[PDB]
PDB file of C-alpha atoms and ligand atoms in Angstrom:
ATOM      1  CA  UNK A   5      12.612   8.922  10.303  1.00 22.16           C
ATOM      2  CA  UNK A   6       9.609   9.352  11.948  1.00 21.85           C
ATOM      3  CA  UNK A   7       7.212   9.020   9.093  1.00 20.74           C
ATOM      4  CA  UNK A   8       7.874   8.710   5.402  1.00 18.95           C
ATOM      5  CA  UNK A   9       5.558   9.814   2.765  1.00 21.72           C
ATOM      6  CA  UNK A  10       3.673   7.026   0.460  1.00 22.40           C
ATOM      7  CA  UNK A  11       4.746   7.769  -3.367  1.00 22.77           C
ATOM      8  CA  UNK A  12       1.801   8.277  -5.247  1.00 21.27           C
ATOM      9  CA  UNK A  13       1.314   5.499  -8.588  1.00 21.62           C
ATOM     10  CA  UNK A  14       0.842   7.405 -11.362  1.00 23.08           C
ATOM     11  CA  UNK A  15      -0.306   5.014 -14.031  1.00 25.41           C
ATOM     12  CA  UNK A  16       0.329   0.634 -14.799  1.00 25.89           C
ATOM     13  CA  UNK A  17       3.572   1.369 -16.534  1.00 23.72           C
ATOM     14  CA  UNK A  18       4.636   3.217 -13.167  1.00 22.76           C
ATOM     15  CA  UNK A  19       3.591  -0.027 -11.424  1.00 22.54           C
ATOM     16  CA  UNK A  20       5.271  -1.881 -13.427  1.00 17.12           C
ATOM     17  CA  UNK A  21       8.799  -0.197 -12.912  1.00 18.95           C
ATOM     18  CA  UNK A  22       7.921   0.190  -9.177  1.00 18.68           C
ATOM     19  CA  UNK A  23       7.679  -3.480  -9.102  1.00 19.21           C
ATOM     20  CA  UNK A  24      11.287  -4.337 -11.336  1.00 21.74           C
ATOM     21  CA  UNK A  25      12.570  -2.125  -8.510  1.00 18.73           C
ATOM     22  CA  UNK A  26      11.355  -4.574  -5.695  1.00 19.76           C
ATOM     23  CA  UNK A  27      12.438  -7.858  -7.723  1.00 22.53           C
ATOM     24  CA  UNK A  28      16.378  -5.911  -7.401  1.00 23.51           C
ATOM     25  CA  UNK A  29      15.985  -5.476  -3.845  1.00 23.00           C
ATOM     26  CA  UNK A  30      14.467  -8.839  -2.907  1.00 24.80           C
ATOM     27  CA  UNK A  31      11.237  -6.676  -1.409  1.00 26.59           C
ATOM     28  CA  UNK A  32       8.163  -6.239  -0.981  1.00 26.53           C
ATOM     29  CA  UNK A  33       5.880  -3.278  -1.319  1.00 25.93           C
ATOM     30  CA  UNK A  34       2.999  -1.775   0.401  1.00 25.67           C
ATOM     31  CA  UNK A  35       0.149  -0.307  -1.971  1.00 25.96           C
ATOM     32  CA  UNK A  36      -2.740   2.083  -0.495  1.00 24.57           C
ATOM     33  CA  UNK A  37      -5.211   2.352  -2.676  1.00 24.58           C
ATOM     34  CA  UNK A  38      -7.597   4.843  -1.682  1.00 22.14           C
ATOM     35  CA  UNK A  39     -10.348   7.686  -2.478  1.00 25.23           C
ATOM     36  CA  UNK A  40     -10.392  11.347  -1.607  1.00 25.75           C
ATOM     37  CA  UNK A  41     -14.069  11.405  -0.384  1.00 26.09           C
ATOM     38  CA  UNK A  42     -13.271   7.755   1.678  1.00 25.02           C
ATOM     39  CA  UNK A  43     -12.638   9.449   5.425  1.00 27.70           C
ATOM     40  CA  UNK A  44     -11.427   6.359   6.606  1.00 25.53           C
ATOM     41  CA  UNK A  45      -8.499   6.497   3.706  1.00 24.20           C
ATOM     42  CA  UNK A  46      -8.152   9.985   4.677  1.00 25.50           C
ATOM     43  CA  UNK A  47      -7.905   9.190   8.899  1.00 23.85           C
ATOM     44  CA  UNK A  48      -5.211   6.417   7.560  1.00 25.77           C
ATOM     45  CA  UNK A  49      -3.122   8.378   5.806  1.00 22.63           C
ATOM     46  CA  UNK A  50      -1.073   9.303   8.673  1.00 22.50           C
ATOM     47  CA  UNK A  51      -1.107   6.409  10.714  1.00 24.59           C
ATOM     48  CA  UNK A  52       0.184   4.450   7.410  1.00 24.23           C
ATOM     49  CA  UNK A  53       3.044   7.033   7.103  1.00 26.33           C
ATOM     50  CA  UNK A  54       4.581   6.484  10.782  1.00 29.08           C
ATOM     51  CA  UNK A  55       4.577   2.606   9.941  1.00 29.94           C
ATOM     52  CA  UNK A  56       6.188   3.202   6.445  1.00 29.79           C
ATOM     53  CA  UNK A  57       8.966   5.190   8.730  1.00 30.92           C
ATOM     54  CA  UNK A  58       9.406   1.903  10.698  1.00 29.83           C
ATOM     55  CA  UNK A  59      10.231   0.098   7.501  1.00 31.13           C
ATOM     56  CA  UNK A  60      12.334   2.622   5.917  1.00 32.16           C
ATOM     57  CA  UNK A  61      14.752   1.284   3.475  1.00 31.26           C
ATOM     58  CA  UNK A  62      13.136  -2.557   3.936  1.00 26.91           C
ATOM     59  CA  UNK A  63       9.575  -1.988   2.183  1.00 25.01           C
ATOM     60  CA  UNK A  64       8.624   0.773   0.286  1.00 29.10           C
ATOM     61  CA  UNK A  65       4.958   2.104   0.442  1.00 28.51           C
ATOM     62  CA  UNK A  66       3.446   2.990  -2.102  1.00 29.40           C
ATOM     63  CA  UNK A  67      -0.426   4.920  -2.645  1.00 26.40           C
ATOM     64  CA  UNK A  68      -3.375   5.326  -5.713  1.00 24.03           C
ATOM     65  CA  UNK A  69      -6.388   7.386  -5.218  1.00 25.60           C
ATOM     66  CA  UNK A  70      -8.384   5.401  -7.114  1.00 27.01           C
ATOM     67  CA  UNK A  71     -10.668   7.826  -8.834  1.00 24.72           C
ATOM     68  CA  UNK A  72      -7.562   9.818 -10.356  1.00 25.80           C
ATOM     69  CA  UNK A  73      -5.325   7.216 -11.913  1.00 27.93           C
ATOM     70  CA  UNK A  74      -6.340   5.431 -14.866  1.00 28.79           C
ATOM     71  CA  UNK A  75      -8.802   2.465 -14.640  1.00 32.45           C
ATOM     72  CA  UNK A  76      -5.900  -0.091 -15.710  1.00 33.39           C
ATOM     73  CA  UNK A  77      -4.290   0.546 -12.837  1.00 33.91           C
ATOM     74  CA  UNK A  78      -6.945  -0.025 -10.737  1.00 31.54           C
ATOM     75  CA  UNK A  79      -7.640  -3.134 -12.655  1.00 30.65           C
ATOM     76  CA  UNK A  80      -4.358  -4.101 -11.737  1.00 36.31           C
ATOM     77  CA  UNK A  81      -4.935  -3.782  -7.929  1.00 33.26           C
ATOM     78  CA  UNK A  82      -8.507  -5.884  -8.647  1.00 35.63           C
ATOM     79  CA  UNK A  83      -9.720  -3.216  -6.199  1.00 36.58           C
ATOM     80  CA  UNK A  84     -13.662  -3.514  -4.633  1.00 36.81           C
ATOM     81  CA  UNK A  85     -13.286  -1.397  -1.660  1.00 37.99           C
ATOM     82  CA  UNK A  86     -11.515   1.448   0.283  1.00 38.79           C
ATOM     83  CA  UNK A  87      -8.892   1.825   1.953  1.00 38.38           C
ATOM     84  CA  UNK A  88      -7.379  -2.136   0.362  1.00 40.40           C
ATOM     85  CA  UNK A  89      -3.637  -2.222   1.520  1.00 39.65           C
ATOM     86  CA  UNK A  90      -1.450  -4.575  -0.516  1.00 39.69           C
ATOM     87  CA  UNK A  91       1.147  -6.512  -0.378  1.00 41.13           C
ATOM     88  CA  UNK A  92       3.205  -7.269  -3.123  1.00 43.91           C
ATOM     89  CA  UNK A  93       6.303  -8.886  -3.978  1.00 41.70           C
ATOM     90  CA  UNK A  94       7.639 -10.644  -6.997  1.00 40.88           C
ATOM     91  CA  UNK A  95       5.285  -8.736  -9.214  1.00 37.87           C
ATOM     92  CA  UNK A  96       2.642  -9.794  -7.699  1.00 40.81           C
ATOM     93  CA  UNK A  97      -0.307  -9.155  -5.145  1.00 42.34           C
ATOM     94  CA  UNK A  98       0.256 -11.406  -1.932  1.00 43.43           C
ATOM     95  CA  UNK A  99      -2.212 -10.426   0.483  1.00 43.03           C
ATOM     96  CA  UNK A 100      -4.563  -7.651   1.238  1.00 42.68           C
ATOM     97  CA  UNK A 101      -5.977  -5.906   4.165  1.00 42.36           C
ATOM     98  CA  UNK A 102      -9.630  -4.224   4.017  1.00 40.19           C
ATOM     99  CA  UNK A 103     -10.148  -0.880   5.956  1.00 37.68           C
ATOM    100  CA  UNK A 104     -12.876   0.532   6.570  1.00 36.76           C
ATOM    101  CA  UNK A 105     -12.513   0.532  10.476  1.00 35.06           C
ATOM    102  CA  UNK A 106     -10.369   2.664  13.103  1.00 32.73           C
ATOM    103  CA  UNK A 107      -7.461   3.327  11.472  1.00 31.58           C
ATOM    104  CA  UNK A 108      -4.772   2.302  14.312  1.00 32.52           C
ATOM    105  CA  UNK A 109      -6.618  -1.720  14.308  1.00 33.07           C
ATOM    106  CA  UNK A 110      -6.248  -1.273  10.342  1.00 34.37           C
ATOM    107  CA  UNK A 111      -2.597  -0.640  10.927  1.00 33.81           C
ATOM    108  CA  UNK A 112      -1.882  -3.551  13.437  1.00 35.27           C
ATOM    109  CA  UNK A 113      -3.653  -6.252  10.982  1.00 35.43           C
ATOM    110  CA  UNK A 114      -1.499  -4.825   8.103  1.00 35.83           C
ATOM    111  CA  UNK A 115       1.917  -4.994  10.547  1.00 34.89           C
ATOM    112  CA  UNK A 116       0.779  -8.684  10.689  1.00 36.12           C
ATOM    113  CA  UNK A 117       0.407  -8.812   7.042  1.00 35.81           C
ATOM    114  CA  UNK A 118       4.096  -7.304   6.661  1.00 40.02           C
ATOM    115  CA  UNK A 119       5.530  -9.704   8.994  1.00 41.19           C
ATOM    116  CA  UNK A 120       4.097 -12.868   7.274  1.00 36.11           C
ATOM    117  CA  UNK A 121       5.746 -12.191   3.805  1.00 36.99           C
ATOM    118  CA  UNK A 122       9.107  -9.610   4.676  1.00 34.16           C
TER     119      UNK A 122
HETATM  120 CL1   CL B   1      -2.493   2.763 -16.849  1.00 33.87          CL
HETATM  121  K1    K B   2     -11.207  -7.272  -4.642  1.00 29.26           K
END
C-alpha cells in the first residue's frame, strides 16, 4: 500500500483492547491525537498515512480527535498539545513527538521515534 488509514480510538476500553492486540504481536503502536480546528493535525493527516503504509503489518497507527472522545481517554494519552504522536508498546506510552511545525519535519522526527523502539 501506498497509504493506510489511522483507525480512529473510540473510547479507554477501545485502547485498552487495541493495546492486548499489540502485546500478541510483540508491537508497537502509533497514536495521533489530534483536533479538528488544529490545521497542523489536519496538514498531517496525510503525510502520517503514507508512513503508516510503510509500516503496514509491523506497527499499527492509530488516531483520537481529542475534543470528540471521552476525557478518560485523553487522560490516558496525558495529552497538553496538538498534534502529540505516540508511541506505545507493552501497554504503555514510550515516547512522544510534539507537532506543531511543517508536517513532513514532524514526520521525519517521528520515523526516528519508530526506529528507536520497533
Ligand atoms: Cl473512556
Ligand atoms: K503532556
Amino acid at each position: 500500500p501506498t497509504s493506510v488509514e489511522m483507525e480512529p480510538i473510540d473510547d479507554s476500553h477501545h485502547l485498552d483492547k487495541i493495546l492486548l492486540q499489540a502485546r500478541e504481536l510483540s508491537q508497537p503502536i502509533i497514536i495521533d491525537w489530534m483536533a479538528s480546528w488544529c490545521r497542523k493535525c489536519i496538514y498531517l493527516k496525510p503525510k502520517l498515512e503514507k508512513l503508516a503504509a510503510e509500516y503496514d503489518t509491523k506497527i499499527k497507527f492509530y488516531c483520537a480527535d481529542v475534543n470528540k472522545v471521552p476525557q478518560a481517554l485523553v487522560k490516558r494519552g496525558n495529552i497538553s498539545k496538538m498534534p502529540t504522536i505516540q508511541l506505545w508498546k507493552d501497554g504503555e506510552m514510550k515516547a512522544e513527538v510534539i507537532g506543531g511545525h511543517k508536517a513532513w519535519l514532524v514526520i521525519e522526527e517521528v520515523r526516528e521515534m519508530i526506529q528507536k523502539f520497533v
